[PDB]
Curated annotation (Swiss-Prot), chains A, B:
KW Transmembrane (keyword) present: no
Name of this chain's protein: Peroxiredoxin-1
Gene3D superfamilies on file: Glutaredoxin
Pfam families: 1-cysPrx_C, AhpC-TSA
Domain Thioredoxin: 4-163
Lineage: Eukaryota, Metazoa, Chordata, Craniata, Vertebrata
Active-site residues, record numbering mapped to chain: 50 (cysteine sulfenic acid (-soh) intermediate)
Gene name of the encoded protein: Prdx1
Phosphoserine modified-residue sites: 30
GO molecular function annotation: heme binding; identical protein binding; peroxidase activity; peroxiredoxin activity; thioredoxin peroxidase activity
Length: 173, 173
């Protein structure tokens, strides 16, 4: 995807995120070296058809934390639009309070490095990337379905990647 | 990935496949226009660690059939290696009988159009692509894990994509 290749360092980024406590903080993917990262890039905070897909991850953020994994959301929304949408109830198409950081990519540079930028317009597809503790991209999954991701499936994947890390000649049976 | 892009026609291919009945037949992705296709590209038929991932799809081929979906496997194995491995019991690292066609890509051209070729060596990663009845690429999922794919998850995804088609403005809930 653009510059994202399985088994190679996940493209780096340094951008401003709206943290769960409300603060704007400029974070880098490298800050999470030492732990797993489930980086989920979605089109926009505002949704009309289904709830923004990132919400289900916020809701289950603790299960990811339990697995030494940090979930980070991202969309081409500016940090103000992010905040604005977090302060808009889910029933009005918004996000509601968030338990994970939301990265802002209004310049679309991150969407590009991850190859999830749409061809005609400036918004992304739904891209999920599982990155390991060493910063290596391990899973790439893209689609334009407002229900593509399954939080249980992703949790199972992280477990498989960790198991593999801790064994490797043995089938994650 | 290579040329594969969500929402765009899935890269075309015409290659020889070992059919379920045992015959070699040159098949094209367009032949399946009208139905869904789950295209699963795996590295090699021969496995040491876990069973080759394509086996789970062969075993459950009828469930995809029920959903107007054809599963097609593919690897850089030649049509002779494919037949040889189909005729090697799963317990010897082989595949055992197959209910779905297995595409051969010894020239690695398909691996390339689908962006699943490794950088250093000539074998692929594990690439799953869900293509719709119109030949449009709908899901791209790559990883190098011998357990990355979940047959239940994929079946769910196909049902979701079909539902989107038949409705859209409504959430698959
Ligand atoms: Cl979404
Ligand atoms: Cl495999």
């Amino acid at each position: 995807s653009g510059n994202a290749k399985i088994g190679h360092p996940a493209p780096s980024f340094k951008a401003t995120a709206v943290m769960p406590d409300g603060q704007f903080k400029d974070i880098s993917l490298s800050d999470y070296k030492g732990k797993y990262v489930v980086f989920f890039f979605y089109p926009l905070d505002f949704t009309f058809v289904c709830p923004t897909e990132i919400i289900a991850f916020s809701d289950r953020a603790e299960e990811f934390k339990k697995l030494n994994c940090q979930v980070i959301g991202a969309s081409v929304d500016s940090h103000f639009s992010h905040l604005a949408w977090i302060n808009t109830p889910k029933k009005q198409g918004g996000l509601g309070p968030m338990n994970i950081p939301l990265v802002s990519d209004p310049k679309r540079t991150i969407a590009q490095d991850y190859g999830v930028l749409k061809a005609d317009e400036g918004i992304s597809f739904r891209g999920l990337f599982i990155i390991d503790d060493k910063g290596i991209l391990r899973q790439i999954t893209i689609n334009d379905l407002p229900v593509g991701r399954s939080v249980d499936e992703i949790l199972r994947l992280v477990q498989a990647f960790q198991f593999t890390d801790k064994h490797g000649e043995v089938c994650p049976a």
